[PDB]
Symmetry: C9
Subunit: 85 residues, 9 copies
């Protein structure tokens, strides 16, 4: 006993998992790489501490936009599954 | 037990759409973090730069985001207008 | 012999595993990259220790947010599976 | 109830998604890494802007060639599926 | 031909547990190698550091290993106490 | 209704997608990393601009060889599928 | 003709493959990155050759611990499969 | 509906061969790009080197390519002589 | 029509492919990263060639150990499949 939505919903959960698994790879590594520059810049140029946070937050904003746009589509896949029967 | 052809096709479409956007976010998050790493370091080294660094930064981010959003458009095709649906 | 929730739960477990596998890739590598800058920065200048831990912990907080938001959605997938019949 | 093209088209969509997911990982990260050198190079020496955009655009052209050759084969897989019955 | 519901659920649990630990080791191996890269370089540059480098090194490795072992705990949940088993 | 080649062909398209998805990850990131050195070298040593292109094209040639050998095997998988029935 | 353990065992081999495939990605890249620092440190500071091996082996030990703990769980999955019927 | 055992085995072989070569090209493309990055930078810094840099470059590329071609040989085994075919 | 070993062998081949795909990612990238330090080190100081090959070959030995231990378990999976019926 199966029904079509069992297979569609399984596909939706696997697809949603790929969306969020990739989002976290991009966000964790992209934010780490941005922070690496912030930390090194402050070590090299202490007086710049305050001004380095502006390009840092621009960068984190871009990185997090990918994470949260992915999250929104994961939510679509698993709560409003396109093609559900 | 009941399946139909579109149950399998739609499951494949969702998995494929998920691969498209999972890979898009890996490329966008890491590419934008690497571009921003250089912006931050460049401003730390040459604070007077700033102005001349944001043009190359925006060109780089534009290229990275183009991959993200072209992928997003094809994810949308896969899941809202699946090619090969029966 | 199968039933619809057997296939849905299998998809939920694979999807939850993708979510946490990607979370740990982003957290382990992003935290390592942040820490690389902290360690290098302190090596270059021992008196900067305090001032470097602040951007380090901001970076780690961002990286860990990805990890734990993913963990929450893994828990949703496997304990309150969206689409279970 | 299934037919052979249902399984073939499912495989084509998964395969097309792998092609484009890998294309974007290579394009986003390769373009980011190229741009990192462009930005750093201009920071070090503002008068080098023109001369650095030339190798940058050569690099981006190579990276984008991978992306768009992959995109063409994704289109082959999902619109003119090889092996469709 | 005989399957039962738990055959499918347990196969999904094992694949999911494998993803959890495969990703955990990718993050732990590369994160710990990157942390150690800085420890090694820092000692090459400032051999008298040593002492002051091991505290940031251990904090970094502790964070990386926390991801590895939290993942391991959920792999164990997935395969020894599978949620949703019938 | 299925037939054996439906499953074989689905496998071939997924395998071909893995081959090209991995090829583009390797090519986009490898070419970006090669170009990063080209751009930085020209920034550091402008007079070397012309001579840096020789090791650059050797490197890109190696990277692209992996991409195109993969492409050839993807073509084999999906147009001349080994094991087709 | 299938039986439940055929599907469980297939899942166990795929899960074991993911465990060891991820372990080798982490170990090969983590050890390479550790060795990069060892080689560069010796190039920069020849007299330090002997003392750099201590932090190097600490680092490799951590990296290999992930590899071999993964190996042990792969062995569990494929030789003492949890949930086997 | 008709399947036979080799349809499933051959589908697994093709997916497995694809993983082998997808991973081979990831390792070869990025490893060769990283090796070449050092060759290019080394020649930028020490143009008179050149000669002494190509031996370590070729040893490194030889190691990277060995992984690529050993993988290729096993992909060929998987898909042209599948172990376990019935 | 199927039999249990058809599904087990399919899982073994996918699992063996994961093992070798991950082995080559770790070996190619880890060896490239080691070699990057060797090449840079010799560029900086040609007389250090001999002394840099020693840590290079230690690093490569570690990286290759991951590759070949994985290769051995791939061979176990596909030639002496654990759980074959
Ligand atoms: C939706 C796309 C948003 C991209 C980020 C843009 C944020 C604003 O970027 C601005 O650009 C200026 C150049 O005129 C810089 O000098 C400023 O520091 C910066 O705030
Ligand atoms: C969630 C994980 C956080 C771990 C925090 C461990 C405590 C680190 O604490 C740090 O110790 C330094 C001395 O080494 C001080 O100079 C810093 O100000 C302090 O933040
Ligand atoms: C879950 C996200 C955790 C990270 C949020 C951290 C926000 C920190 O905010 C920052 O604090 C700095 C302290 O010096 C200031 O210099 C900056 O101006 C300020 O933006
Ligand atoms: C396909 C994406 C290409 C984007 C190109 C954007 C235009 C960049 O144009 C660049 O502007 C520089 C000044 O900032 C000039 O010095 C360079 O010569 C010029 O190429
Ligand atoms: C799709 C591939 C796009 C990249 C192809 C770029 C080929 C550029 O070719 C290069 O042009 C340089 C310009 O200074 C010259 O210095 C080099 O000698 C020449 O090889
Ligand atoms: C199980 C966790 C093991 C983590 C590695 C710890 C190995 C011992 O680490 C020791 O720490 C000292 C600080 O007191 C350093 O000065 C020594 O060089 C080091 O041997
Ligand atoms: C099939 C394997 C091809 C590997 C690339 C080799 C390309 C030729 O490499 C040559 O090696 C010389 C050393 O004698 C270098 O000095 C030259 O710059 C280079 O052209
Ligand atoms: C398993 C792959 C190992 C390849 C080893 C190739 C031989 C490299 O041999 C190296 O040659 C150098 C000169 O270039 C010598 O200075 C080194 O001492 C020597 O180890
Ligand atoms: C399969 C694993 C291969 C790598 C094992 C290499 C062990 C080398 O051992 C090292 O040899 C060095 C030579 O200078 C010494 O300086 C170190 O003290 C010693 O620990």
């Amino acid at each position: 006993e199966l029904d079509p939505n069992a297979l569609i919903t399984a596909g939706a959960l696997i697809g949603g998992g790929l969306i969020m698994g990739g989002g976290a790879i991009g966000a964790g590594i992209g934010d780490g790489i941005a922070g690496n520059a912030l930390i090194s810049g402050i070590a090299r140029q202490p007086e710049a501490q305050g001004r380095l946070f502006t390009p840092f937050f621009i960068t984190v904003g871009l990185v997090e936009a990918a994470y949260f746009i992915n999250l929104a589509f994961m939510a679509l896949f698993v709560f409003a599954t396109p093609g559900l029967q």
